[PDB]
Amino acid sequence: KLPPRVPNLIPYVGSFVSFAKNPVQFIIDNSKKYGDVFTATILGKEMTFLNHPKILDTFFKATDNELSLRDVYRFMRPVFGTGVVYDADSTERMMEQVKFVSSGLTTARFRVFVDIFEDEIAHKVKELGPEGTVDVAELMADLIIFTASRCLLGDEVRQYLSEKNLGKLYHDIDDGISPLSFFYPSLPAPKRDKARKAVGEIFQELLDKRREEHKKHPERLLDESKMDVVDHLLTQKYKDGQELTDVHRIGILIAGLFAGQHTSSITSSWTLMNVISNKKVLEKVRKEQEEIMGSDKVLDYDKVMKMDYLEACMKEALRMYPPLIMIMRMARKPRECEQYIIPKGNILVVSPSVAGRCTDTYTNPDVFDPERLTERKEHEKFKYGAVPFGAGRHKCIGENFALLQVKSIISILLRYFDMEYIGKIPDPSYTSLVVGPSPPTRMRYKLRKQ
Ligand code: HEM
Numbered sequence: 001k002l003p004p005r006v007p008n009l010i011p012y013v014g015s016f017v018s019f020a021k022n023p024v025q026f027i028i029d030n031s032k033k034y035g036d037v038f039t040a041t042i043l044g045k046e047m048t049f050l051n052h053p054k055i056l057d058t059f060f061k062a063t064d065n066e067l068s069l070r071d072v073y074r075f076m077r078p079v080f081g082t083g084v085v086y087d088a089d090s091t092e093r094m095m096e097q098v099k100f101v102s103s104g105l106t107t108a109r110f111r112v113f114v115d116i117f118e119d120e121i122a123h124k125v126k127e128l129g130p131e132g133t134v135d136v137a138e139l140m141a142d143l144i145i146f147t148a149s150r151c152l153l154g155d156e157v158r159q160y161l162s163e164k165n166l167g168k169l170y171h172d173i174d175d176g177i178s179p180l181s182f183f184y185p186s187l188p189a190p191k192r193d194k195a196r197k198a199v200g201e202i203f204q205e206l207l208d209k210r211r212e213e214h215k216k217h218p219e220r221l222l223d224e225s226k227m228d229v230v231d232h233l234l235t236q237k238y239k240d241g242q243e244l245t246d247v248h249r250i251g252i253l254i255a256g257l258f259a260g261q262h263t264s265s266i267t268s269s270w271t272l273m274n275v276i277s278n279k280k281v282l283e284k285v286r287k288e289q290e291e292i293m294g295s296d297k298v299l300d301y302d303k304v305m306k307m308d309y310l311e312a313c314m315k316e317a318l319r320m321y322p323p324l325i326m327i328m329r330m331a332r333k334p335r336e337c338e339q340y341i342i343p344k345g346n347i348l349v350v351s352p353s354v355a356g357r358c359t360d361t362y363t364n365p366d367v368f369d370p371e372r373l374t375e376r377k378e379h380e381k382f383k384y385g386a387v388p389f390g391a392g393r394h395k396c397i398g399e400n401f402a403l404l405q406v407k408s409i410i411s412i413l414l415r416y417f418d419m420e421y422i423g424k425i426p427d428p429s430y431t432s433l434v435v436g437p438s439p440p441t442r443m444r445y446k447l448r449k450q
């Protein structure tokens, strides 16, 4: 047969409400009811949910003629741009773009990023003062609105991030992208579109400056450690010889910068928060920190490689708060899963949010406990037991940059500060397309060298 169905409140609207209440809880409740698979009409979309690691093989290895991304995240267009990534001409033109960014994220560059991380957290401590309080959130995003910019675009950008308000414009973009937009791609959003244009120009500009810097400084091109994304773009040609257009450029910089900022700064928040609020942890971390930093007064890519425990904390925050709670693919052929046959036109959904709290994989899964990963190995149980980065053909290609970018920021931060958190770990907030713990998230901080 077809999968069971969430019986609807109404035709059309279907189950939008209890889904929208808590997207994840929804999927969990109904799993227990109707089993490993089940369909639910949500604002007129046929969304089948796959709900047990065992079965997620097919979802991830199917091809983009079988299971389309482009179909489903196409709505991102007004953000990224036209003919870009999910709105790109093809499966293969997307990939080719993806890789352009992922070339800005090489071992050579990573070494330079760690220096950038410092340079900025320095500039940042100034703004704070020896002690006070601050929304962790606001800070991660604010650190990360600066680091990434430089990491991918290069220090050239910083004069804009500073003088020209670029952060704010990012928010106008990034606060005009409801997850509703998925069900209504044409929901009018003028103030975003003004921002995305203003950005557009600047990103253009940027290239226009960067071109003259190649004429005046060609040697840059041979040196792997200044070859940022912008360059890779300015000096590459799709695999068939077709040139890239500045609008493909300007739009792929943003495609990245989007990928870069939010998911990370949210894991920066969720992780720290659980560390400075479990003393057995904040311990082990500072042991590792101090073992490693030794006589050194600043960070390096090798140090950060060795920050194993801390990574388990960030892994753990992802099992507790994966900021992409839902991975989606439209079906174009009909699909055989288990005994069922999911029909063409449906949308297939898989949740990390869920998979991280399944109970065969994880004991006391409401308990933040890096030892579940490092000693108990709970994530190795099933081959898709934990998937914060996705997997198969579309596995995140920022994984290592991410890990690098946070681990670095949290380390560097601890060093500077003794910090403690105020009241409980807030719950997730399901208001945005990237899911982060809910405001306010304040913490006391005071320094460590007079
Ligand atoms: C907490 C940090 C992050 C998490 C949890 C995360 C998660 C994911 C997940 C779950 C997917 C799979 C989407 C799918 O299969 O449908 C993905 C794909 C992707 N990610 Fe990330 N990511 C993170 C950071 C980054 C960063 C920092 C960048 C770039 C700077 C990035 C760039 C991308 C790109 C380009 C893909 C495309 C894969 C494809 O071609 O479909 N990610 N990520």
Ligand SMILES: OC(Cn1cncn1)(Cn1cncn1)c1ccc(F)cc1F
Pocket: 073, 085, 254, 255, 256, 258, 259, 260, 263, 324, 326, 327, 396, 398, 433
């Ligand atoms: O996959 C995302 C967008 N997305 C997927 N579901 C909901 N939003 C996020 N992402 C994952 N890692 C980093 N960002 C992405 C993929 C590529 C990209 F260029 C932007 C972008 F948001």
